[PDB]
Amino acid sequence: ENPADKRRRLAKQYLENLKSEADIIASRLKEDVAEQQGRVFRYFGDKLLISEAKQSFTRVGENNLTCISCFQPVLNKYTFEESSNGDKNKGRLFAYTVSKDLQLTKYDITDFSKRPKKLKYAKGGAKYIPTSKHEYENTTEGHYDEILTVAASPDGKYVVTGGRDRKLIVWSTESLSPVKVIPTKDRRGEVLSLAFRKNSDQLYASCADFKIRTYSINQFSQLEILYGHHDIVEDISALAMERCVTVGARDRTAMLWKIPDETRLTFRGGDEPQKLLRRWMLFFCEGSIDVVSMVDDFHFITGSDNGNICLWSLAKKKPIFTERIAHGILPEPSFNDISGETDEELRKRQLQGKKLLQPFWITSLYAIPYSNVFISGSWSGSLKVWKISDNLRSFELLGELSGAKGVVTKIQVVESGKHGKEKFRILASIAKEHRLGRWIANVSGARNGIYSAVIDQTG
Amino acid sequence: NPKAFPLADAALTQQILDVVQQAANLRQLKKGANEATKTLNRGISEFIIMAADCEPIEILLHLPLLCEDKNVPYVFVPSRVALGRACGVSRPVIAASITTNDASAIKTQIYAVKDKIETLL
């Protein structure tokens, strides 16, 4: 009857389940704690069947979807309680999306065979503008300006959003009711990316004021502010530990932040075409690093504005491996449009051969934690799946999924099924314009919606 | 030969946008063609950046006539879409100009790119 007895009961029931499932028992228990050890332990890329993937694109009403966040309950071995907030939410998978229309919307994705199903939503508007005009008085319940990011707490109790209102609003998962509003207290403290520490209430916020903020959601309080980036911090990623990584965009420095040590590691690409062409004896100078994801505690990957995907190791400041023009080159502008001269050849000279051709940029780049595979996104019209070599010194193209059409603002992955047989569902937010701004020329075929594809493992 | 000429390489474009993107932060940047036309006649512009992929390119070829008549350096760059990202505005920019201020915190950076630009021309 005592709580320790309850744990003894749950542990006893847990073992009986493992015995029913079945060496194998010992290996699984080690796999249960493999997360604590900072090394990849999910080698399932070769098992994935991309060709047979059931791809599906779900349209929605929102214009210009900006980000999507997914919540997956996980059984805690350490107390035998699922991360579901309540009994009703046992084994229910939720996805939260934000767009430039000032809506937060949640969907149910538990049924992988079925499409996401809307549950609740909240709109912001001009009603929520602050009258005071003071940063510290910017505590209105709702958004009034573009929402850019959304992150769901690992506990499944709260979801946090931020955007061009310079706010961090945390919402109740069940009802999408506002419980707290935390101003950044800066003129240019523009939230650009949010990352939750895995299985923790710690939140890391990357702000365009050139700073990173750290938060504890369970306390509704600000912890620390991080400096060192020489430009806007567009992306941030976090894992079970506290060493979150960030990228500086035009600063071109992928940055790892050791919170426990208050020390920081600097990573720079430092590639230049001239030698690269010489060693070859279209390669574009790197533009900015606009996405980052941590494959492992000791490794991470980045995406750039020359179409280059770079693999990184904590030991080495320089990239260990790189793929150039991963998503290809943009279509060349039409000759009938480049110039108004009727003579076709005159119009062709304005194309200047292939000098004008530029590469796609890596709008989205997500890696499943502690796995050998990750997914890259752009507006090329296809999601590319890559597999990292066992030595983690190179990666190759596993395949592609052409279902999505439009700019991939964010990518998420959720899995279901037994441990041995797991079927992966990839969810990617699709928009008609880039999340940060409207620079993109309207790409034919783009639709603002959530892309969904189901992948299963065999052999 | 091409109307959009001279066009900066992958490298020289790099330092240019770095000047542009910072200059926006310092309120030293006038963005877009009509502002480019604005600054040239008032003679407050260091040099002018033009996108070579502009639709149509001739919409901005008037600026070099103004620029070189006033002996102001100018240049073309491949992608308008990148310039707006540097410029900090949420839309593409086809033309941009850096205004004159000897008291700017970046006089050395601007003059550095300016010198390279003159050699390119």
Binding site: N336, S339, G340, E341, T342, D343, L346 | P56, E58
Partner: peptide
Amino acid sequence: SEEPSNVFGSVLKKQVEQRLEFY
């Protein structure tokens, strides 16, 4: 343009027509 065409003028006028209706 050494030998200008009217293709752009047509669409540019069309853009004005859309604005005219909007206001």
